[PDB]
Amino acid sequence: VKMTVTVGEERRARLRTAYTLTHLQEGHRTFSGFIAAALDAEVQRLEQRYNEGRRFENAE
Amino acid sequence: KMTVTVGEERRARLRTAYTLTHLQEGHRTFSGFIAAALDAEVQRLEQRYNEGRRFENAE
């Protein structure tokens, strides 16, 4: 069971820096929440572009 | 650290979205897709809060 995604050391550092400098303005209370919101926004964008705004079904 | 935590369900949604859209989105690997999504967010934040410049830690 995988609960993480690989980003790389440098990218994680860039994300931490971006978070520190912008999280109050963006309304994110934790780094975990910042990451979750960014990734969920991408999935939603792809649903809109390619799946008529509907959720994609996971493969059974 | 080289990873970020997303949780089991979110990882599954990311894998599904990647599988179904990667070719037209221009990503050859899942990690490339993840990197691009997160880099696009950092870039969006740079534009909004730092006039498009790279972020720097306070020293």
Side-chain angles (χ1 to χ4, degrees):
Chain A
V1 180
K2 280 164 189 165
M3 298 178 187
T4 62
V5 294
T6 295
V7 303
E9 167 186 329
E10 285 205 335
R11 178 169 288 103
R12 189 178 164 99
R14 289 198 304 276
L15 288 160
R16 171 62 68 186
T17 297
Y19 171 79
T20 298
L21 297 171
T22 67
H23 74 105
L24 295 179
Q25 304 94 303
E26 290 283 294
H28 300 299
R29 274 48 166 254
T30 66
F31 183 72
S32 302
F34 162 63
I35 295 297
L39 291 170
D40 283 356
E42 179 63 15
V43 173
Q44 288 158 19
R45 192 183 70 83
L46 295 172
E47 292 167 1
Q48 288 300 140
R49 297 301 179 277
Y50 301 114
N51 210 46
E52 312 277 38
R54 305 206 180 181
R55 294 189 281 196
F56 295 111
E57 289 283 337
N58 293 334
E60 182 217 56
Chain B
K1 289 178 74 62
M2 287 184 69
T3 70
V4 295
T5 304
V6 300
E8 179 185 11
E9 293 309 317
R10 177 168 289 105
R11 190 182 159 95
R13 294 192 300 271
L14 287 161
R15 279 237 67 117
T16 296
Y18 168 77
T19 297
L20 301 173
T21 66
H22 66 86
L23 182 64
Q24 70 265 206
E25 288 286 297
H27 313 297
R28 296 195 82 259
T29 64
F30 181 69
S31 297
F33 159 67
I34 292 298
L38 292 168
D39 287 349
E41 177 59 13
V42 173
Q43 178 165 294
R44 191 185 70 80
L45 295 168
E46 289 169 354
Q47 291 168 7
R48 177 164 171 78
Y49 297 109
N50 213 37
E51 305 84 38
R53 291 176 294 104
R54 307 175 187 82
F55 290 124
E56 307 167 82
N57 295 317
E59 303 282 354

